[model samples]
Target: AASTQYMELNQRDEKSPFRNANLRKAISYSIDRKALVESILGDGSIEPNGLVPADMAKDPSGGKDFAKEAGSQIEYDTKKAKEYWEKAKKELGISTLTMDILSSDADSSKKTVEFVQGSIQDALDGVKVTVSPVPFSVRLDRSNKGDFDAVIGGWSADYADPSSFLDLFASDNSYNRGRYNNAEFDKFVKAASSADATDPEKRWDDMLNAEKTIMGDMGVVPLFQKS
Candidate 1:
């Protein structure tokens, strides 16, 4: 197997449809699975999503609030989703938005972008997201230079902790693609991962809230987390 660099474990929204679940579902459904595997991975490959076995159609993972003792909340409606897009547009002041997406000139990245481009175009009529396929070296250079509105990126956890997932924007963490910085978000993540809150339930609450801060702030629309 080839060595994979994990850029992210929990999903943070920087891409279109930045709402976590919406982004997750869109990305999941965007791909033509048979084509993706055959053309990209080229055989002996499989794509699996969540570890919780939660149904995307049903949202069996419950709500984002880990503190609540409740069943999963999965609501899939195109009409309802447009509201989120509306909010995103208003907040972003984005009208006739053109997303200049950057991708490495690699087969794998190409495949991913192809699906994304198709999905976004189909889903979002008002926004125009253009793909700029560049050499990997050039893409890296652009990313370092902040040359585009949004480019695809990911992050890998250094160790297992809420912070491992939440500290992507820790003032200097390299993965802060949204350039989002906030003290409260950072503080909650730190509090959640504190030594005293090691109990499974307590830890879960901390992690969930830490993520909530991220989501609420529109810091990043978390896409899919680890599967």
Candidate 2:
């Protein structure tokens, strides 16, 4: 199976409430990743517990799932989600929000957007989502230009390392379309990249920690991945 086709939330939208870390985490818990994988995909799609797919790297921690090792993160919990949303709403001083979600005009892509729209609205009060299906190139252009409140994006690994996905969200990386900037995440990724080539364990640990940082912060809502 090739590593491709996953959905991501846009954290870079300054005008969007998703910029709030609590709100992002709230959103993360609101979506049922398993439901999406089982119902919509209905194939061999992998439900990602973290940014990096599970099979991408060898477990230097001796077969322990890095996401589990990092601690409990990224799950569907409406109760906790509403609690965080209340805090986010109060902090942001806003009552209602309307977000435009960008997606490709493909039928499957439109369906995915519809599912997200339904899930988000049902989970959060006073939050309205409008799905904007555009041409593939136009959707990419809008995302690159940061013209949408949120957009669905996926990545195929550029290499055979966790950093291939982690580095994409780095503060300095141009590929960081969502502009997610976290000092600790950048630090950990840098450490991972700088670790000795022969010291595989240390590099793996650093990458795992970096992923933990990202998931903890809810830098992006990782939807299912196609196998």
Candidate 3:
């Protein structure tokens, strides 16, 4: 895979619906990754359960694939999705929700977003998702400015380390467009990149836990590895 495709939720605004962790998790669990990848992104792309793609990185001491060790954190389970969705609705005290997803206007992107729209709506009864296509730069600019409800975003690695993929969401990273603001997530990423950088095993574990922190919270919904 050359890069990854993901959905970033806007949580910078205190009042944003996505600020609720349960709702973000509901969105992540709602995706039928196998179907979405095979049908919409048929260019040999693969569904990824974590930010780090398979074969991209490995354990320093054991040589285990980062993705393999991470296993399948992201899954499609309408039952679980509904549970989380309901909790979000209860906490937010609303029966209905409508969200706009901003994405690139590329043909493939448009088609993929349409399928994803159905993916969420079908699983969560009262949720309605609308897709908005804009120029690539516009999508990036708007998301950077926190001008979106949900946005499609992706990244390609310049380095072989997992930090290359994980740093985008670092609390201080300029690319942290969603403003997830989880200090625990930031701590692990910082360890992997600095304090534990030389201790291969510790650094590996640091990266491992970092992935867990983000995926467990559904901080960013990973979709697929772009082939």
Candidate 4:
């Protein structure tokens, strides 16, 4: 094997962290957000149907930038995802990858787990994932307690600046679940969020560099962003 740098450049990758967008998409596809939310919130809650989240900005028609190739940065293509997954497997001298999906014990959460597991397996080969379903309260508690291999999470900012989103994963930020610690990640994240990145294009360059590094390191999924 090539001694994977295992960068996760952005998110935490507990299993086979070597730029496997296939795995990323496989996981993303497996998510049935509507069902999970409905179960959790009953009829009062909704899936939102867009990555922007209801709290975020919405177009005049309440439409979101769901374009596959738009200002938004996510697209759904199982074939592309599988290609990436297979490439990673081949490079790693393996045909299968192991993964774990964390879920709450409620029917909705369990269903979410089941759906995600099915989607990944249905979409890729040589892949195996285990789902651990715990009581709803226990799951929430554990998440709060920071006990998980991979957990479903989200973040939002009160302000539009990059700094608004940079604090969660700081080495010292209590919210970092993966326990990802790196002086450089902290520094880059700081710079990106700082006034120093004031120029439009300049800040973008800095942000993109951070994106590349974090994605390269598998820091976070960079899974798909809307802005």
Candidate 5:
């Protein structure tokens, strides 16, 4: 009856500076995920990085945690945020930027979007963010069409496997609103989805690798896992 939620950043925009990997990296680092959990989410959730929730995955490495295994690819660090933002500014030839985030009109959704907007604008210099709250249906439609710079989204597991979450961002996945494409990432997902299904160790490894690849590319930002 409950689920986790996240914000989908569109990397498909060729004209948008956010398409730059460094810019995405900066956004990830700038976000104070811990504060989001405490302030916006309260104690009902916890910050997550990998698409797969840590406790949901059956780790092959002696039941190790998947999020821990994926490592801290996007942990917050103000210095790193400035470093990546500077690199992005130089590479994109822009010092100031503006972007909009889409979210549902639900009270909780609006509150979360507002928090993200404030956090991002405060943490990164020369960047302005706006939050657009729309109907739940509208948000999904625009997200699939890639009509927004970013959108608040979430996923619930269809099954217990890690692939339940990891496969959503595969290059060919229709739900991949971010338009993230990496052939290498696809390979791992494919193996995990098919060939490795019965092979627990291989499946775990593939899924773990897939998660690492996604986070490393900053394909999507994992906000919080609802408990």
Candidate 6:
């Protein structure tokens, strides 16, 4: 089962710069996801349209494609990223940001961080990035403990359901690595599973809304889908 690789920013720290959604959005748009797939993971992995992968489900209304309808929620625009960066600076009341990015020490993982480091630092001036690639075991430990600024991570669908991915960042999930918290995000995700369970139509809509809320908030940078 191929997984969706993402860059998860640590928001658990009250004083962390990533707490600002605008800053997160800036970082999100700065990277070229296509380039990441083309250059690094050249084994046919595709950039993800959203949290849930394509072909994962078909909805009511004569069987509409959920992923196709949802479309791509991520983008690559240096100008927009800069604009958001400026806004974040003004709102954050700062001119510079320095953070470490964590990932496993595999050859591909090391190269991926370097690519991301260049992408983000180049797109946004006054931003300093450090790439930290440790052993997979150590990286997992740090992620569970929220011991880093940003980490490269991935989540594969447990059972071909959107909840398998969306529920991970619901603020209550055990694997909410970055500790992203939003009441509205939780609402839609829960509704998609519980209240909207029996009703396929309502549940589908709820899942769509849930993805929008988190993506709009730049909760996690949906990097790419593994082949």
In order, candidate lDDTs are: 0.48, 0.76, 0.86, 0.49, 0.81, 0.87
Write candidate 5's Cα lDDT for 45-87 as tens digits: 8887557776666576586777777775768887888898999
Q: Comparing candidate 1 with candidate 4, which one achieves the higher TM-score? A: 1
Candidate with the greatest lDDT versus the true structure: 6
lDDT of 4 by residue, 122-153 (tens): 77777776777877677556665655556644
Name the better of 3 and 6 by lDDT. Answer: 6
**Candidate achieving higher lDDT, 2 or 5:** 5
* Candidate 3 TM-score to native: 0.95
Measured over all alpha carbons after superposition, the RMSD of each candidate to the real structure, in angstroms, is: 7.5, 2.3, 1.4, 8.5, 1.9, 1.4
The residue-by-residue lDDT of candidate 3 on 1-227, one tens digit each, is 35878999988877878878899989988988888889777888888868887788878777788988977678888899999999998998788889889998998888888888889988999999999999988987898898888888798887777888888888889888888878989989999889537888888888888888898888889889974
**lDDT, candidate 1, 80-197, per-residue tens:** 4455556556665565445666766677666666655665556655756678779867867776666655565544434333355566655455666545566776776666556776
Candidate 5 TM-score, true structure as reference: 0.92
RMSD of 1: 7.5
Assess every candidate by TM-score.
Answer: 0.58, 0.89, 0.95, 0.57, 0.92, 0.95
Stretches off by above 4 angstroms in model 5 are 195-198
Residue 47 miss distance in model 5 (angstroms): 1.4
- Candidate closer to the true structure by TM-score (higher is better), 1 or 5: 5
Order of the predicted models by lDDT, top scorer first:
6, 3, 5, 2, 4, 1
Expressed as tens digits, the lDDT of each residue in 47-110 for candidate 6 is: 8887778777677766766678777769999999999999999988998999899998898888
> After best superposition, candidate 6 residue 23: deviation in angstroms?
0.7
